[PDB]
Amino acid sequence: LNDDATFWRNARHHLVRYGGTFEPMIIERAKGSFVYDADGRAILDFTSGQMSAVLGHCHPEIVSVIGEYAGKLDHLFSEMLSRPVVDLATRLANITPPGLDRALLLSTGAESNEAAIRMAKLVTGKYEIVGFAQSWHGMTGAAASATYSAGRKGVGPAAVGSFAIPAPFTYRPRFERNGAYDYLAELDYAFDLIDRQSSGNLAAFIAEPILSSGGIIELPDGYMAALKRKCEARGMLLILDEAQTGVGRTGTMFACQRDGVTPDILTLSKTLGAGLPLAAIVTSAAIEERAHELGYLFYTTHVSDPLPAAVGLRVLDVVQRDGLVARANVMGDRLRRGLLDLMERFDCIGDVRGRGLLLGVEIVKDRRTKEPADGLGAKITRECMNLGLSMNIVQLPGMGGVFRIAPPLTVSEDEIDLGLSLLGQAIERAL
Amino acid sequence: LNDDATFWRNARHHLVRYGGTFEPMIIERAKGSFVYDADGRAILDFTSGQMSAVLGHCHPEIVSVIGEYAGKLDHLFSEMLSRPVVDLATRLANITPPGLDRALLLSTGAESNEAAIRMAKLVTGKYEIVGFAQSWHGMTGAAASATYSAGRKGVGPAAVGSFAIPAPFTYRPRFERNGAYDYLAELDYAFDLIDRQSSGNLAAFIAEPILSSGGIIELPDGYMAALKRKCEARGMLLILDEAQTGVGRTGTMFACQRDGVTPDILTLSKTLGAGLPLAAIVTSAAIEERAHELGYLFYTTHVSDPLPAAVGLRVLDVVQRDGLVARANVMGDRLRRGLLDLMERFDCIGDVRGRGLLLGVEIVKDRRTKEPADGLGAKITRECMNLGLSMNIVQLPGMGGVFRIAPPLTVSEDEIDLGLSLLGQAIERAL
Amino acid sequence: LNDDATFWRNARHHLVRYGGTFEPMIIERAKGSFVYDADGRAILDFTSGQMSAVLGHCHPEIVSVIGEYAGKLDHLFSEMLSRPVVDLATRLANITPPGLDRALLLSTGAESNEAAIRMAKLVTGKYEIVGFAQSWHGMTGAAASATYSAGRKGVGPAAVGSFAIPAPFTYRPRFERNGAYDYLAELDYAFDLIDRQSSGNLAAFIAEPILSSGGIIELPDGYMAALKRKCEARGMLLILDEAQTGVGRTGTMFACQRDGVTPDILTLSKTLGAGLPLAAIVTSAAIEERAHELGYLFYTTHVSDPLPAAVGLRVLDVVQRDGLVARANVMGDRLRRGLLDLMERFDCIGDVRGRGLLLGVEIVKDRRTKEPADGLGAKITRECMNLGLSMNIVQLPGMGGVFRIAPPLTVSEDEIDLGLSLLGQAIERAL
Amino acid sequence: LNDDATFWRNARHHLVRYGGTFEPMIIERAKGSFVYDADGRAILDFTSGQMSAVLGHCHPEIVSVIGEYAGKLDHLFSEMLSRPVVDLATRLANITPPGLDRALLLSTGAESNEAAIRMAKLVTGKYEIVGFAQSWHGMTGAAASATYSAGRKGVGPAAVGSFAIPAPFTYRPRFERNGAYDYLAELDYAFDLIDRQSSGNLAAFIAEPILSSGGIIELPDGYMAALKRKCEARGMLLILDEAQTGVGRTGTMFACQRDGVTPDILTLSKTLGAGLPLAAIVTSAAIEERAHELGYLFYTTHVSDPLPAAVGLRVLDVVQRDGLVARANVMGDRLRRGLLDLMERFDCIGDVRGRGLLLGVEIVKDRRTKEPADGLGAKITRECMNLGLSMNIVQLPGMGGVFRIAPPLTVSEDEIDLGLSLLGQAIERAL
Ligand SMILES: CC[C@](C)(/N=C/c1c(COP(=O)(O)O)cnc(C)c1O)P(=O)(O)O
Ligand SMILES: CC[C@](C)(/N=C/c1c(COP(=O)(O)O)cnc(C)c1O)P(=O)(O)O
Ligand SMILES: CC[C@](C)(/N=C/c1c(COP(=O)(O)O)cnc(C)c1O)P(=O)(O)O
Ligand SMILES: CC[C@](C)(/N=C/c1c(COP(=O)(O)O)cnc(C)c1O)P(=O)(O)O
Ligand SMILES: [K+]
Ligand SMILES: [K+]
Ligand SMILES: [K+]
Ligand SMILES: [K+]
Ligand code: NA
Ligand code: NA
Ligand code: NA
Ligand code: NA
């Protein structure tokens, strides 16, 4: 049983709480799209752990590669190179679009954003950073200074030169031009204000292609391109944080490929490490060369460690070899249609959005007023859990609660159907 | 051969440079205290990779535990608990001194410092951070804002409320009182200035027990205690960054045990993960409770991931089981005496300092003037490498170059002797 | 002649340039609504010097009071009181609306804003300041940190927690709601963004009732009230900077009286000193009491100096005694109608706005496109000068050039007519 | 009587308190070295009001010049020049040392420091400012960010890049080198720390030649020169704030003349306006030219106003014409010897320091321990007042209370003797 009193005693005595609440179960093992509690119950993992396990849990190939290296090349002095490192960097330059040439291999998502931000500052000689008002880039200093969906209060001043602009949100539009939601006009208006506040030290704009924690907000058609131009006009770099979008999830290897806009620096992490801590930034040779002449520094313990690099390479291999990017579109489409069917059945489902296998369901009181359904989201979530489906909801001011659905790229048709049934049931009991 | 032209071609084209310079060899495999290049040559690793591999490379136990978990519980939604996580947190509360009760398990050293700093700010409601002028706490925002041995220029303003004071350095004393280096008087004088600059928002002091990158500077007798009192009087927390000192390296499980001073928050990382990316903070229950009521947040992808937690637990087991803390004193003593013998033989060795198996050798022009020997350090380093010994030197303004010696806790008598011979030879050729 | 070569030689050698350009004439004397060059030519002063001389130049009463005091009570230790000081403070509490009780008498406009800002920070225990994106509050640190119409670039970072929102501008509206310029909806939208960026340290909003340097922008109907509520909901103070609007200029003793909204702190300066350097803040007793218990400090050399205080009291007397606030409406109305007649005659006049005797004329290429007429403004200005009328234009990005008209409250019907004729002529020659 | 209940009623109801406490008397008039209360009692003004009235109160010449201008050229549009302005700027270039060429005429001391600081930032392209830990430069933002003797707590973060170093204090030395107070070694040590904290954006050092509010601390022999070199090596400007030292007070026209070190920017105010609000900065032509090409801006209402400029010119004339700088040395010497005699008589007088007519007396418990005499200072001060002598004491942590003595340059032998007798008596009653 999950009730192991010694286990819960120690958990209460010895863990630091760091957000949210601990599920009242003890995860014993995990395989593929499921995890198992201490009673042996299988929970369908619709979030791929913490949005990372694109190949599912304990993927046999990952398992072999991990075994191989643990026993042969584990960790090294940060100035020593090895194959897995060079292969992975090379691999990355190759599958990213042209203009993305050189890579740096780190450990976490925030770390990858900090490295990108530091580099932008170094090459521009400026320090002001702009992000979206519902972003999430990490808990470390600079990453946090650009994170706006939460965490800003009580922890002292943010970094000097931190600015946010509203993200374009079609579902709940707030900016009109001729009885129309003109999100590009909104962009202009936003920048104008920025320009007027800047000290003249604009270094970069950092952005997620789809705001995940922000509520699965997809940047609409043309936005990105337009965004890129705003930067270029201002001599700013564009940093795209693809921690949740990269490596196939949205139906392209990388989300920026969809818009055909290549950022100056691209950052990766969650899905790249598929559960392990590996992260990266990729930039152009020109930018790298300049950072280098300027003395760019970002020296860590695990930068360029072989084991993790090895794991990342295998993940890419598998994705490619198995056409998992394409699978993402097929399963994604299967899941989306199901969600849409639920939305036919239940009024509280106000919207279903997203791409590929990174989907959002916004819970609402009523589809007409689009009024946030408070408490209801949490109910459903609990019912899912009882039913054996692991879900995640995010709640922002002025928005209904949003389920963030992100099953493994390896998920099966069945598993999709199952989740879909569990969710319907959960909604039914929760009303 | 290490000359693989395709390998070097790709390395040049696709890697981001991030400090220092790449060794011109290709590391193929690693085992115990050695690494091997592509020609099969064995290099004695006197720095334990990047100062982490306390059990050496590819330790059989680490290898099994890694295997076990990769295949059974890899990575989870950050709100789900599992045994390895609870066991490790518990284990940590138990081997740390009283007052250190609750743990948070993360991935990197900087991340662990950011979490500690954020928490200090939250519980104090203040934001000013003080560190040593030769410190190194990490490359991420806040960690970097408190890092003074390098990296401060060209990357924009540091965090608001960043202050440093001089670290007590007995080898090159600068503060006198009655013809004596009164490092405590220096401390008072330092604080007075701080007090006068503060906006009245002093939150914490962050410190390494032994400044590693700072040049292996050991806090002298009574300093720490006195430091702790300065904080307490000011309502500040004391955060001890034991990334390189923890887990046995200096001859005690933790360096603070030596002084018998328990910090408010303790951070760990390098040696705890023994090569893998695992890190942690440990605090008192009271502090944790308060952070919790205040809404402390530090939610990441890999916080509380089972695999790494599992690895950390095994590392602790092994250390304990094999009396490696005690071994650290014995080998350390064997290594220190050797260094001292070299210092008898060569004038350019100005000082040998450190504790247990974390030792420093400061290179000097002449023992009397204690004038920095410029270029000489680098020579020696290169000669070592040719000879098959991997070393590391750090160079600060106003100080001679310092070799940072940190062989695995598992290092053998032979391996020690060998390194000692290689180094003598290297110094000989380099003169 | 104005050509005095020694005079210009010295001017070139010994003055620091500090913005704009020196008129090529030598002002020898001034009286009433005119100034005289070295050739004895009379220039009609339509800006009341630098927007201050509400009683005109060298007003006989000011002249007597100045004489009186220079000879009897000039300047004192800042802890000694005298009558003029107490009378003026009292006078101020009395003519300001209820809720405005206690005064502090300083020297300049920026100084008065700094004192208000410091006090807001002290009583709220917070530090974030919000202003308008086209504001001007002064050249000193904090005042400058909240000044957005110009001066932000090249001089380092602004104060931490500086934010701006767009000012409501009816002439060139940018925010629509149902095919309408919904300036209140714009306000909401603005605040939402602020809220999301704040660290939770909102202390005050600072605002001019009519943005003078911003282009004579009048806060539309209901805005202020709504603004005040946004603050109150957030626990922020409202500081109204009435440097150019106070003391009768807009047809009420103080502009806030028109909206019937009383700010938390009111600041005055230009018109209060009528040419001399006197300035003030007025606040509620409650706010003052609290600032006092918290140790509010703002100790200067000239705070509470008798001479200037004496001058301010006389200015108020005269204004009251002569019904100059009422005169402001009558002359203002005479001037406005004239401007409107010009606008009938010339296409380049796009708008005439303002209140009482603080009027703006926006120069435009064509009334339909409302396209900024570049160069034209400057022409006109030069022609005015030749014609003997002193004018001032301000130019902001995205706006046509704006003449800022602000003749003395003592201006005569004739003088108005004259200026009106000179301006027509100037426009005629300039086309 | 000073008891006017209506007067005190209004004072209590309508004044904002801003530091310190109001003397319980009503100053009715002032003349020469005295002020008179409402009972007609004459108080000898040993602080020249608030340290400004170098020609005493109501000096007949000041009075005429003031009269002249009030009636002829009072205040102008900031872009119009006039003679008094050009004459004064010229005059200033001429009496300052070579290298000081161009002037900007403002209103207050803080304003003058803000203008200097802004300009330093503009020309260096950097923003970090260093001052003394016991300085006082003003209450406005930047001036306050560099003020360390008081006011830093409770009002939010200071300006980014604010640093202080200890001022050299011979009376209570804290830095030793070979059993000697090596204040220059202290300077080096200080800078080293600064260097290590800087982001590489050092713009200027701002300093008072004698720290007035800091406790009448005189920069010892060679310090300044050495300080200037530290700056020059770092590419920083040196700004000397001579608000209390300029215009004769210390026995030279300007204090920097004594050391023969010319700062990059010199600021003046108190004594220059001799009671009226006038202030200035003086810089080199090169610096000015560069600030100008970079768009230096510092446009205020009263910059370049004729009346005040006129007053400043007269003050200079008088000082020169009457050899008041020389008089300062003679009277200063008469006053100093008296103080020394008191120090013979009373143990509580620990030190008498200063120069010319800017003298300090530090009150101590006992001359041997040099222990601060708490409460005693305040007693004496009160007794002086009863006796008819106006004095001022400043109290800093770790220092005894310090009387700041600064009688007018026009003070008479008698007046000196008188004060000297009153003070002796006051000390006698107070023991
Ligand atoms: C000084 C650079 C070096 C990489 N040190 C890293 C380091 C970190 C950061 O850990 P990270 O986040 O990098 O994992 C935290 N605390 C201390 C005391 C450290 O020495 P090393 O000393 O090993 O060379
Ligand atoms: C929003 C909180 C969550 C943990 N996200 C983390 C996250 C990180 C940080 O990675 P880390 O440093 O934590 O590894 C970086 N960039 C994006 C777009 C993210 O969503 P998630 O979305 O998965 O719940
Ligand atoms: C220390 C407080 C006192 C008012 N000093 C004011 C002061 C100012 C400010 O001038 P302000 O802007 O105030 O006119 C600038 N520089 C120095 C060296 C000063 O001592 P004082 O010393 O006279 O008591
Ligand atoms: C905009 C530049 C001008 C000089 N304005 C100065 C100004 C000040 C500063 O007063 P200062 O400290 O300068 O005395 C404060 N508040 C407002 C609304 C102002 O317009 P003006 O509008 O008169 O041209
Ligand atoms: K490494
Ligand atoms: K996790
Ligand atoms: K005063
Ligand atoms: K002026
Ligand atoms: Na690419
Ligand atoms: Na413990
Ligand atoms: Na009132
Ligand atoms: Na000169």
Cα–Cα dist A341/A358, whole Å = 18
The encoded tokens of residue C259 equal 């909206």
Angle at CA C167, nearest 5°, toward C163 and C170?
A: 165
Question: Nearest 10 degrees: CA dihedral of D217, D220, D224, D225?
Answer: 180
Interatomic CA distance for residues C33 and C37, integer angstroms: 14
Q: What is the C-alpha to C-alpha distance for residues B66 and B79, in angstroms, rounded to an integer?
A: 22
Residue C21 CB-density burial (10 A; 0-12 exposed, 13-18 middle, 19+ buried)? exposed
**Are C279 and C272 in contact, with CB atoms under 8 Å apart?**
yes
Which residues on chain B are in Cβ contact (under 8 Å) with D175?
A: 175, 189
Taking contacts as CB-CB distances below 8 angstroms, the residues of chain C near D141 are 114, 140-145, 159
The C-alpha of D333 sits at a distance from chain B's nearest C-alpha, in angstroms, of 34
Chain centroid, CA A374 distance in Å: 25
Burial class (CB in 10 A: 0-12, 13-18, 19+), C195: middle
Residues 6 or more apart from B426 whose CB is under 8 A from it? B380, B383, B384, B386, B387, B389
Structure tokens at C180: 């309408």
CB A48 within 8 A of CB A32: no
- The DSSP annotation for C43-57 comes to EEETTHHHHT-TT-B
**Residues, chain C:** 431
CB B92 within 8 A of CB B103: yes
Amino acid at D316: L
Query: Which chain B residues are within 8 Å of D150, Cβ to Cβ?
Result: none
Distance separating alpha carbons of residues A213 and D388, to the nearest angstrom? 72
- Min distance C139 CA to chain A CA atoms (Å): 15
Probe site for chain B from A7, A12, A15 (most B CB atoms < 10 A): A15
Other Cβ atoms closer than 10 A to D9: 12
How was this structure obtained? X-ray
**Coil/strand/helix, residue B207:** strand
D398 contacts in chain B (CB < 8 Å)? 192
- Pocket of ligand 3 contains residue C79 by CB under 6 Å: no
Closest Cα of chain A to B203: distance in Å?
A: 10
Cβ neighbours of residue D197 closer than 8 Å, sequence gap 6 or more: B133, B148, B152, B162, B163, B164, D163
Catalytic positions of B are 136, 208, 241, 244, 270, 404
Residue among A21, A82, A122 whose CB faces B26 most closely: A82
- Write the CB contacts of A160 (distance below 8 Å, at least 6 apart in sequence): A127, B156, B157, B160, C157, C160, D160
The token pair that represents C11 in the structure block: 């001017």
**Are A20 and B270 in contact (CB < 8 Å)?**
no
Token code pair at residue D289: 């030219």
Bridge-partner residues for B280, per DSSP? B105, B268
The reply to whether residue A80 touches residue B25, judged by beta carbons under 8 angstroms, is: yes
Query: How many Cα atoms within 13 Å fall on the side-chain side of residue A50?
Result: 25
Q: Do D296 and C11 touch (CB under 8 A)?
A: no
Catalytic residue among D45, D101, D114, D208: D208
Best mutation target, B16, B36, B102, B302, to test chain A (most A CBs within 10 A) = B16
Catalytic residue from among D102, D383, D404, D415: D404
Strand partners, B164: B131
Integer Rg of chain C from CA: 22
The CA distance from D134 to B192, in Å, is 12
Is D118 exposed, middle or buried (CB count within 10 Å of its CB: 0-12, 13-18, 19+)?
A: buried
Instruction: Report CB contact under 8 Å: D197, B164.
Output: yes
For every residue of D1-16, DSSP letters joined together read -TT-HHHHHHHHHHB-
The atom number, within ligand 4, closest to the CA of D78 reads: 4
Q: Do A197 and C162 touch (CB under 8 A)?
A: yes
For ligand 3, is residue C301 a contact (CB within 6 Å)?
A: yes
**CA nearest neighbour of C280 among C307, C251, C236, C312:** C312
C270 carries an active-site annotation? yes
- Which residue of B133, B161, B176 is in closest CB contact with D196? B133
Q: Which long-range contacts (CB under 8 A, 24 or more apart) does D66-69 make?
A: D66/C66, D66/C67, D66/C70, D66/D307, D66/D310, D66/D311, D67/C66, D67/C67, D67/C70, D68/D310, D69/D306, D69/D307, D69/D310, D69/D311
Contact (CB, 8 A) for B331 and B46: no
> Which residue from D minimizes the CA distance to B151?
D199
Q: Which residue of C has its CA nearest to D14?
A: C102
Residue entry with tokens 């709601």: C177
- DSSP conformational letter for D170: T
Say if strands A42-45 and A389-390 run parallel, antiparallel, or are unpaired.
Answer: parallel
How many Å lie between the centroid of ligand 9 and the Cα of residue B6?
18
Cα distances (Å, whole numbers) of residue D256 to A194, D100, D212:
44, 12, 15
Measured in degrees and rounded to the nearest 5, phi and psi for residue A323 equal 55, 40
Nearest atom within ligand 2 for CA of residue A277: 14
Contact B164 D196 (CB under 8 A): yes
CA dihedral sign, ordered A248, A251, A252, A258 = negative
Q: Which residues of B8-30 are buried (b: 16+ CB within 10 A; e: fewer)?
A: bebbeebbbbbbeeebebbbbbb
Pocket of ligand 1 (CB under 6 A): A 299-302; B 50-51, 108-110, 136-138, 208, 212-213, 241, 243-244, 269
C278 Cβ contact list (under 8 Å, min separation 6)? C105, C106, C107, C269, C272, C308, C309, C311, C312
Q: Do D199 and B158 touch (CB under 8 A)?
A: yes
Compute the distance from residue C300 Cα to the ligand 3 centre, in Å: 6
Query: How many helices (H) does chain A have, and how many strands (E)?
Result: 15, 17
What does the alpha-carbon distance between residue C140 and residue D123 come to, in Å, rounded to a whole number? Answer: 17
Report whether residue C108 contacts ligand 4, using a CB cutoff of 6 Å.
yes
Q: How many CB pairs under 8 A join C and D?
A: 380
* Count of other CB atoms within 10 angstroms of residue D68: 15
Separation CA B43–CA B385 (nearest Å): 8
Q: Which residue of D has its CA nearest to C270?
A: D301
Which string of DSSP letters, residue by residue, matches C257-288? HHHT---SEEEE-HHHHBTB--EEEEE-HHHH
- b/e map of A75-92 (b: 16 or more CB within 10 Å)? bbbbbbbbbbbbbbbbbb
Structure tokens at B142: 């806040």
Tell me phi and psi for residue D320, to 5 degrees: -70, -55
Distance from C-alpha of A280 to C-alpha of B73, rounded to nearest angstrom: 24
Nearest-angstrom CA–CA distance, C266 and C243: 9
Mutation pick from C15, C37, C199 vs chain D, by most beta carbons of D within 10 Å, is C15
Neighbours of chain A (3+ CB pairs under 8 A): B, C
Q: Which CATH number fits domain C59-322: 3.10.350.10, 3.40.640.10, 3.40.50.300, 3.40.50.2000?
A: 3.40.640.10
Catalytic, C134? Answer: no
- SS3 readout for A391-406: CCEEECCCCCEEEEEC
Q: What angle do CA D122, D76, C104 make, to 5 degrees?
A: 75
Q: How many CB atoms lie within 10 A of CB C144?
A: 29
Contacts for C94 with CB less than 8 Å, ≥ 6 apart = none
For residue A379, the distance in angstroms to the closest alpha carbon of chain C comes to: 27
Q: Report d(CA C282, CA C256) in Å as an integer.
A: 13
Distance of CA A52 from the midpoint of ligand 6 (Å): 9
Candidate CATH numbers 2.60.120.10, 3.90.1150.10, 3.40.50.2300, 1.10.287.620; the one for domain D27-58+323-431: 3.90.1150.10
Strand runs (DSSP E) across A183-271, as ranges? 202-207, 210-211, 217-218, 237-241, 265-268
The rounded distance, in Å, linking the Cα atoms of A85 and D41 is 89
In chain A, where the domains are located = 27-58+323-431, 59-322
Distance CA C297, CA C79 (A): 13
Compute the distance between CA of residue C407 and CA of residue D77 in angstroms, rounded to an integer. 12
**CA-CA distance, C13 to C10, in Å (whole number)?**
5
The backbone region for C9, taken as left when phi is positive above 0, alpha when psi lies in -120 to 50, beta otherwise, is: alpha
d(CA A220, CA B210): 53
Distance CA D396, CA B284 (A): 38
The H or E element that residue C90 is part of is helix C83-95
Please give the Cα distance from B400 to B372 (Å, whole number): 4
Roughly how many angstroms between the first and final C-alpha of chain B, as a whole number?
30
What the block records as the tokens of C115 is 């004192």
How many angstroms separate the CA atoms of D4 and D39, rounded? 11
- In this structure, the strands spanning D29-31 and C389-390 are unpaired
Rounded CA separation A193/A212 (Å): 26
Verify whether ligand 4 is closer than 6 Å to residue C51 (CB atom).
yes
Ligand 3 contact via D110 beta carbon (within 6 Å): yes
Do residue C125 and residue D154 have CB atoms under 8 angstroms apart? yes
A371 is written with which tokens? 């009024």
Residues 6+ apart with CB under 8 A from B326: none
Q: Position of tokens 């249609």?
A: A337
Distance CA B355, CA B374 (A): 26
Q: Which chains does chain D touch, 3 or more C-beta pairs < 8 A? A: B, C
C365 is catalytic: no
Cβ neighbours of residue A359 closer than 8 Å, sequence gap 6 or more: A216, A332, A335, A336, A339, A352, A353, A404, A405, A406
Of the candidates B257, B236, B303, the residue with the CA atom closest to the CA atom of residue B78: B303
Q: Three-class SS of residue C289?
A: helix
Say how many Å lie between the CA of residue D49 and the centre of ligand 7.
7
- Ligand in closest contact with the CA of C103: 11
Dist. CA B113–CA B269, nearest whole Å = 10
CA C250, chain centre distance (Å)? 11
Cβ within 8 Å, pair C154-A200: yes
The two three-digit tokens of residue C307, written as one number: 């001479």
CB B22 within 8 A of CB A96: no
Q: Which chains touch C (3 or more CB pairs under 8 A)?
A: A, D
Q: Which of A105, A140, A300, A305 to mutate to test the pocket of ligand 1 (most atoms within 8 A of CB)?
A: A300
Q: Which of B34, B41, B50 to mutate to test the interface with A (most CBs of A within 10 A)?
A: B50
Asked if residue C23 lies in contact with residue D85, where contact means CB atoms within 8 angstroms, the answer is no
Backbone phi, psi, residue D429, to 5°: -60, -30
Residues A104/A281, Cβ–Cβ less than 8 Å: yes
What are the distances in angstroms from CA B318 to CA A168, B69, B209, B410?
54, 17, 24, 10
- Cα–Cα distance measured from residue A387 to residue B305, given in angstroms and rounded to the nearest whole number: 24
